[model samples]
Target: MVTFHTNHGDIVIKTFDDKAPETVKNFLDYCREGFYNNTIFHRVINGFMIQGGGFEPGMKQKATKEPIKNEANNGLKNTRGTLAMARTQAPHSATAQFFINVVDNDFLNFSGESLQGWGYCVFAEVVDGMDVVDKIKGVATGRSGMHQDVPKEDVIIESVTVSEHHHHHH
Candidate 1:
């Protein structure tokens, strides 16, 4: 389990190691190193998703490792409360950015082996604090320079901690 301490509230996420081993491993590595600390939820789209983990407080993106392979074929859906990797136009370009789906986004799911069919990888799910995510989704948003759907007021992630007591039996 990973707990996100954010300004609105804390959100607990449970990684599905059985389904997305590599993606879970990558996310846990970031949590272990506190890479998500003090980062802002840079993008929030109401009725869609809340994205973060790659940018600092002022929209300055933090350096990340080489993009991980697409794991959307793991069979997880981008349903509400599910955590998915945020990637660029390149199908395998997901590095550190992630998002929590605010609703069922079927269009973003893996459909085929083609590039356009490659979907965001869903590795974790919100085990607690969905209300906090909802609150974040309700915040007022505006474009931040070239970026769209940015929150006007910063919604910072105070920290992301891995639960020491969490078992890896899954």
Candidate 2:
């Protein structure tokens, strides 16, 4: 179990490490080390997903360590309530950017190199406070600079904390 402290409230997620060990461990390491504190949910497309935890509120991209290998082949799907990593247009570019799926996003599957596919990797799922995600999804969006679909209100992640209880199964 892991807890995400947001302005809205706390969200606890169960990482699917048994299913996707590398990806889940990488995410949990980042969370425990305070990589997501004060990170803003920079993108919130209606009917899509709410993404953030990479850049600060000023739009300054936070420095990240090397990205873990892509675990898309780990068999995790980007279904509703799943937590996934958000990458650039490139496949291996996923760093700290992450998002929680508000709906089942099947387009993220690997079709081939021709189509980039959803390109994001699902690492965890929200086991609690999904209603908070729904609240953030309900916020109005605005033009963030030339960027479209930025949330009008700042849905900030105050911090991400991982519980030792679920760090590994006994």
Candidate 3:
């Protein structure tokens, strides 16, 4: 599990470890390395998604490692509460950046093998704090530097914590 402690509020995400192992491992690696701490949610589309984990508060892009392979074929849909790895036009260009879908974003899901058909990889879902996600979506947004759909005020990610929860079956 990953907890995003942001200025807006806390959002808890439960990773799809069994279904998307590679994506989940990559995200957990960043969490352990403190890569997301102090980052800002640079992009916020009110009705679509809120993106972050790539830029600082000043809109500076963070230096990421080589992009990972596209796992859009993992069978997870880009529905609300699902966390997906954000990539460029290149299908396998995903790195550390990710987003949470506020609404069902079917267009971002993988439909075929072609370039246009390759979609973002969904590796996690919000298990708690959907209200916080809603609060973030309601914030006023505009252009920030060269970035469109940026939140005018910084929605800082204070830190990301990984917690282990033990479940017991009686």
Candidate 4:
């Protein structure tokens, strides 16, 4: 499990270890090395998704080890109150970019359509403080360069940590 601490609030993602063990392991590796510390939520679309967790201001892309395969086939959907890895046109370029769903995007739910390209992989759901995710979604936004999404105030991810659930079946 991974715990994200941000200015907006806290979010916990219990990865689908059974569905996408490789992707889960890669994400955990980044978390363990503090790859998301001080990273900005560079993209934020109110009804769509809030993307970030890998990058800084001025579009200064960070160094990533390599790209991960599109686990979009992992039987996950980009539903509200969940986390998904963001990618590019290749459908497998997702390295560090991740997003939190603020709305129920059923279209993103895999239906096996070639035109849909590769669906976003929903690795986990928010177990607590979903209002925090909603609060961040309510923030003002504008066109961010070539991208139509980006937060105006810049929601920075302070840090991410992994630990045994103190309150759950551990």
Candidate 5:
């Protein structure tokens, strides 16, 4: 499990370890190395999804580690609160960037082995603090240079903490 402490609030995540092993490992490695600290939620498209994890404030892109393979075939859906990697036109180009689905995005699910069929991989989900995710998603946004849907105010991710034990009823 991971908890992202952002400016708006804390958003906790539960990763699919067995299902998306490599994708989960990549994300947790970033969290453990403090790579996500100070990163900004660069893309904020209401009714679509909020994306971040690769850009710092002022729209500066952070250099990421090697890209991970697409794991959308793990039977995961980009449903509400599910986390997915952001990629370029290339199917295997997902680096450190990711997003939280605020709605059921069935279109992004894997359909075939073809390039067009390889969609975004959902390897985690918001187990807690959906309200915080909503807060970030509802923020005011505008274009920044060639980029669009950027939050007018900086939505900074203060830090991320990964826990060995993911749950407790207390």
Candidate 6:
């Protein structure tokens, strides 16, 4: 499990380790260090998704490790509250930037092994504090430089924490 302490509020998520293993690992790797700390949600599109984890306030981009493989074929859906990697039009170019789906985005799901089919990789889902995500999506947005859908005010992720996932027994 992982928790993001953002200015709007806190959000907790559970990684789909069994499905998107490598992508989950990559996201957790950044969480374990403080890489996502103080980063702003650079893009927020209501009814679409809110993206972050790779930029600080004022749209400052952060350096990250090499891009990882596109694991969208992991058989996960881009449903509401699910976490997915944000990448360029080029496939397999996601590093640390990610987004939380605000709605069921079936069109973004994997279809085939092609440019249009290399959909975003779903690695996690918000397990709690989803209302915070709702608040984030409701914020006013405007463009910044070459970026679009940026929040007019800063929706910063103040910090993050990671912990082991505990399973329940019958």
Which segments of model 1 are wrong by more than 4 Å? Answer: 166-170
Residues 17-95, candidate 4: write the lDDT tens digits.
7887777888888899999988888888888888887787656678997989767787777778888888876667889
11-73 per-residue lDDT for model 6 (tens digits): 999999999988999998999889999999989999999999989988889999999999999
Model 6 TM-score (2 dp): 0.96
TM-score of 5: 0.96
Checking candidate 3 for backbone clashes, the offending pairs are: none
Cα lDDT tens digits for candidate 3, 1-170: 88999998899999999888888899999899999999988888888999999998888888888888888898889999999999889898899999999999999999877799989899999999999999998888888767888888889999998999899999
lDDT of 4 at 85: 84
List the candidate 5 regions with Cα displacement exceeding 4 Å.
166-170
In model 1, the clashing pairs are: none
The root-mean-square deviation over C-alpha atoms between each candidate and the true structure, in angstroms, is 2.2, 2.5, 1.5, 2.8, 2.6, 1.7
Clashing residue pairs for model 6: none
lDDT of 1: 0.91
For candidate 6, give the lDDT.
0.93
Please give the distance, in angstroms, between residue 6's alpha carbon in candidate 3 and its true position after superposition.
Answer: 0.5
Ranking the candidates on lDDT from highest down gives 6, 5, 1, 3, 2, 4
Error of 4 at 167 (Å): 13
Lowest summed lDDT across 10 adjacent residues in model 6 is found at 158-167
Error of 3 at 158 (Å): 0.4
